[PDB]
């Protein structure tokens, strides 16, 4: 039904443009909204960039200057945010909405594209198998994890055994250091069932179209 | 154009009780028409932000019942009945009279549940990183209550404090505790100078650390 999706780079080099794309679903993007874009910075301040409204009017936060355009896409059922000459100062999660004349955008936020701009090259992450020293006190539970390192940009998605491992899993914020990116990811499980049962971390980087599957094997 | 302040919460809510959460503007939000245009948004932990309220009082469409809003022109108050685990993030309100559409800076909803200590996990570099050159010995600490804990990390029973580096997850939505991860990044080289490597955590849970360790 009636959602909106946001698609585009995730790094962009200073200088360059930054574009993204806002996909409306379930309903005509002629439908009678302001189709919005909203940025949300690290430290997560929110600023309204600007909104397009009947397919050709537009306005825009000054804060942007004149980098900013708003475009649509009858066609496509898309609106396109582009914003020029960016910096590192304009590197933020973006969200396309819908508002309408109160205020109200219902459930109609897209679920958010980082953007990072920065010059530093897109690397994919190395990910190594964290299993424990030797034993401990079997019979409960055992916790195993996957460390992700070395990648750039954000995001990494983790999962385990491809997603069939949920509950009590850790994904752990990256920490960013001389423009590479590390995280790990821990999950627990009963110990009757590893290593007798298998389990894989699967570690998806979507900015270097890579997918790396690490099994966890005993020391 | 228009500043929007939110108040910090000093304390963190027991699922069950109800909390006020307060906003204020610099410009009185109340319109010709006699609506006040206010909204206030959760953005649960990982998320998109959630409209709660618009009109500063109007329930968005399938939000629970539990949130409120009332309010003068100026100053605003989000009320959360019988506060629910789940419902831990950071609530923001949002004036909609003047362009542009300024958000307030949040305020972070924490829940307070029982005390619990970390499950404290130690890890040795994989081989396939040494291969590379490279060590770095994990440790985490999970599911812990309260937020506030110290991790130390010895080698060969001396404390080390460089090429440490910490992360912290954001207060879980299912069960209202924290995770740590500390990672100890050295060279092979450094790696295999030593023989036992320490992850030592303290936490208001017990005065002596939780300490994991192997040797190498
Ligand atoms: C700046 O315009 C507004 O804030 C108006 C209105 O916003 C718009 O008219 C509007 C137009 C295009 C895009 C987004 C909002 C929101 C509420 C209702 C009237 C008035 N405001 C109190």
């Known amino acids: 039904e009636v959602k909106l999706s946001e698609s585009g780079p995730g790094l962009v080099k200073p200088s360059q443009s930054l574009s993204l794309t806002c996909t409306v679903t379930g309903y005509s993007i002629t439908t009678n909204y302001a189709w919005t874009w909203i940025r949300q910075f690290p430290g997560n301040k929110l600023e309204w960039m600007g909104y397009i409204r009947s397919s050709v009017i537009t306005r825009y936060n000054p804060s942007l200057k004149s980098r900013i355009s708003i475009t649509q896409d009858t066609s496509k059922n898309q609106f396109f945010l582009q914003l020029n000459s960016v910096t590192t100062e304009d590197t933020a999660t973006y969200y396309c909405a819908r508002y309408d004349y109160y205020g109200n955008t219902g459930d109609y936020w897209g679920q958010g594209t980082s953007v990072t701009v920065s010059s530093a090259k897109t690397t994919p992450p190395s990910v190594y198998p964290l299993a424990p020293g030797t034993a401990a006190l079997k019979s409960s539970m055992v916790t195993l994890g996957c460390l992700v390192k070395g990648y750039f940009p954000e995001p990494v998605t983790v999962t385990w055994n491809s997603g069939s491992l949920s509950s009590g899993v850790h994904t752990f914020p990256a920490v960013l250091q001389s423009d590479l990116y590390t995280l790990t990811s821990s999950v627990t499980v009963p110990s009757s069932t590893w290593p007798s049962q298998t389990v894989t971390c699967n570690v998806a980087h979507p900015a270097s179209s890579t997918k790396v599957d690490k099994k966890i094997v005993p020391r | 154009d228009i500043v929007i302040t939110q108040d910090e919460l000093s304390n963190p809510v027991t699922s069950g009780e109800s909390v006020s959460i307060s906003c204020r503007s610099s410009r009185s939000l109340l319109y010709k028409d006699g609506r006040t245009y206010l909204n206030w948004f959760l953005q649960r932990p990982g998320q998109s932000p959630q409209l709660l309220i618009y009109?500063?009082?109007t329930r968005a469409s399938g939000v629970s019942d539990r949130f409120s809003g009332s309010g003068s022109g100026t100053d605003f108050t989000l009320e959360i009945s019988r506060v629910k685990a789940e419902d831990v993030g950071v609530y923001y309100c949002?004036?909609?009279?003047?362009?542009?559409?300024?958000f307030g800076s949040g305020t972070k909803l924490e829940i307070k549940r029982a005390d619990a200590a970390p499950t404290v996990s130690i890890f040795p570099p994989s081989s396939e990183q040494l291969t590379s050159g490279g060590a770095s010995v994990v440790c985490f600490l999970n599911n812990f209550y309260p937020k506030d804990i110290n991790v130390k990390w010895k080698i060969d029973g001396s404390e080390r404090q460089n090429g440490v580096l910490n992360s912290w997850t954001d207060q879980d939505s299912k069960d209202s505790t924290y995770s740590m991860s500390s990672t100890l990044t050295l060279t092979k080289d450094e790696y295999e100078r030593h023989n036992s490597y320490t992850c030592e955590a303290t936490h208001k849970t017990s005065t002596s650390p939780i300490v994991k360790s192997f040797n190498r």
């Open positions: 009109l500063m009082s």
């Open positions: 949002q004036q909609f009279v003047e362009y542009p559409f300024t």
